[PDB]
Symmetry: C4
Subunit: 176 residues, 4 copies
C-alpha cells in the first residue's frame, strides 16, 4: 500500500482516489477566560453533561474549584470527557480557559453542555463556545460520504486508512 | 530527476514548472443507502452500463441480490467495472451504498448508468449520484492542458511523471 | 539551516518567516492543436522572437516543418528558447501542441512572439496562448517583494534559498 | 508523539486536533527602494523606535549612512531589532530596501516606527510599509485561540509543539 500523501491519508489491488474534506470532530466546549488557573475559584455545585451514555453531572467541590481543580475533577470523574486548561491571549488579562472535549468523534457521539450550577464562586464560569460532534467527510472517486471516525477499513478494501489531516480540494491517489 | 514536491508530482535537463489542477477522474455511480449489505435484496434482472467497449448488461440473480451479492456479480462479470460497498453515515439508518467505478480515467473512457431493471426487490436500488470520466488538468509553464491519465511521458522529456495529488494553485518546480 | 517545509522552500542565526506567493515565471507561448506531430507540415519561412538579446528569427525549412521538426530547429537555433511538443486532449482530434519557453524567469527576461511567417503549410500554425515572464513574489516577515529567480541569497543572510513550490497563504518558518 | 504533518506542526495520551491558522508575527517595517545599498547616503541624525522596553533612538552617523551602514548600526545598537537589506524588483531602478524587524512575535511585543530624523541625505529614507506584531492563531478541537509565540506546551499536555507553517483550513491530527 502506498499513499500519494501520507500526511493526508496513510494506511496499512487498484487505483483509489480519496479526498479528506473534513476530519471527524469531537464534541467540545470552552470556558470564558480567567486571570489565573490556580487561585480564582468558580464555586461549588456541579456541571451537567448530556452524553450518549446518558446525563452526567460532575460534582465541583469548593475545596478546589480553580480551573485547574475543575479540570482534574472532570478528568477523575471518568464520564467520557477530557478536560484541559488552555491559555488564549485574545483577552490578555483573562487568558486561562477550560476546554472540555468528548473522547469520540462522529454525529452519534454527541455531548452537550446544558447547565453549570455553581454557588459562591469568585467569578462566573460558563461555556462561551461549544462545538457539536461531527462525522468526517471524505470523497471516494469524487463522491462525498460521511464516516464516524478518522479511519476506514471500507474505502480501500483490505487496508486500514487513517486520516492524518483535512485537505479540502486536495484529492490524493492511493495504490495497492 | 527531482520534484520540488514528490507528494504532488513524482517521476523517474532543465527547469520544469508543473501544476496539477485536477487529477484524471474515473466514471462512477453510487447507489441510494441500504440498511444492510447482506440481507435486503434488490431483486432479479439486470443493471445496464454503456461503456467504451459497448453496452454491457450485468445479470442480477435473485439467489444473491444483497448489495454484497451485486457487488460480487458486477466484479465477476469482468465488464471494465469495479464495485464495492461503502458505508455513508449521512443516513444513519441506511448507511450502505454500492459504488461502481470504471477502471480508466479520461474523457475517452466514459461509462454511463442508464437503466436498472429489477423485479421483486425488498427495496429499490438506484444510482443517486454519478460522475463522468474526466481528463487530468495540468499546467506546464502556466498553460493548462488536459491529459487522459495521471501520468505523462511528454511534459518532462525523458521522464515518466506520476501525479500523486491535485493541488490547484500550487505550482511545483521539477529538475532534471 | 532548517526549513519548516522543504517542499516549499529549502536551502543550504535567527527566525525567518517566508511565504512563496508565486514562483518566478518563464516567458512562453503555445501553439494551436495539430492532429499529429510528424506528418502535417506548417510550411517554410520563419518564426520571430523578440528577446532580451534582441530580435531572433528562426528559419523553418520545408524539409521538416512538422511540429517535431520545428521543435528540433528552434532548439538547434540556440536563441535562448526551449521547444517541446505536448499533447493536450482539450481537442481530441488535434491534441499536439508546440510549447516554446524562455530559459530565464523574471520581468527582465521577457520574450514575445510577434510574427509567424510561413507559406505553403498543410495547416496554419499560430501561438493560441502566450505568457509573459514574471518575477517571483515572496513575503519576508509579511512584506511582499519581487525576485527575478526562484532562489535568493538575500532573504536569509548566509543561506542560498531555492523555492520548490508556490504556496500562497502558507507562511513557512525557517531557522539558522 | 506523532504529528499527522510535521511540516505544519511538530513537537517532542490522546487524540489532538490542531489547526495553525496564522503564525505569530514579528513587528516590522520596510523602507522605500534605493538604487544601491553602498553609495547613496540617507543622512545623519537618528531613527526612532517605540518598543516594549521603551523608546529607542538609533543614531545614524553620516560616516556611513548607506543602507548597508544603517543596517549595521541598527544591528550594533542592540535595541531588540534586526535589520537587513533586501532586493525588491517591484522597482527595478530602486530595488534595495531596508527591512527592520522585532526579535519577538505576539501582540505584547509591539514595535512602532514613528519618526526618521535625517539631514543632508542624498535621498529620503522612510518606512513605506510596516506590520504590527501579532499572536499566532490556532484551533484546538475547533476553537480558535491566540498564542504569543510559534510554540506551545499547553495544547498537548506533556509536549512542546513548534508550529512550522500556517495552513488555514488544514486541521492536523496529533497523537501521544
Amino acid at each position: 500500500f502506498l499513499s500519494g500523501d501520507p500526511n493526508i491519508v496513510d494506511g496499512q489491488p487498484g487505483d483509489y482516489a480519496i479526498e479528506v474534506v473534513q476530519l471527524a470532530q469531537k464534541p467540545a466546549a470552552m470556558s470564558n477566560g480567567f486571570p489565573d488557573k490556580d487561585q480564582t475559584q468558580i464555586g461549588v455545585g456541579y456541571i451537567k453533561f448530556e452524553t450518549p451514555e446518558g446525563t452526567k453531572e460532575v460534582y465541583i467541590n469548593g475545596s478546589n474549584s480553580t480551573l485547574d481543580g475543575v479540570m482534574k475533577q472532570i478528568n477523575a470523574a471518568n464520564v467520557g470527557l477530557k478536560a484541559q486548561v488552555v491559555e488564549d491571549r485574545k483577552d490578555q488579562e483573562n487568558p486561562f480557559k477550560l476546554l472540555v472535549s468528548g473522547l469520540s468523534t462522529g454525529n452519534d457521539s454527541q455531548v452537550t453542555f446544558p447547565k453549570i450550577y455553581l454557588l459562591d464562586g469568585d467569578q462566573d464560569m460558563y461555556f462561551e463556545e461549544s462545538r457539536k460532534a461531527q462525522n468526517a467527510k471524505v470523497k471516494v472517486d469524487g463522491f462525498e460520504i460521511e464516516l464516524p471516525d478518522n479511519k476506514s477499513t471500507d474505502l480501500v478494501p483490505g487496508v486500514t486508512l487513517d486520516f492524518k489531516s483535512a485537505a479540502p480540494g486536495r484529492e490524493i491517489r492511493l495504490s495497492v
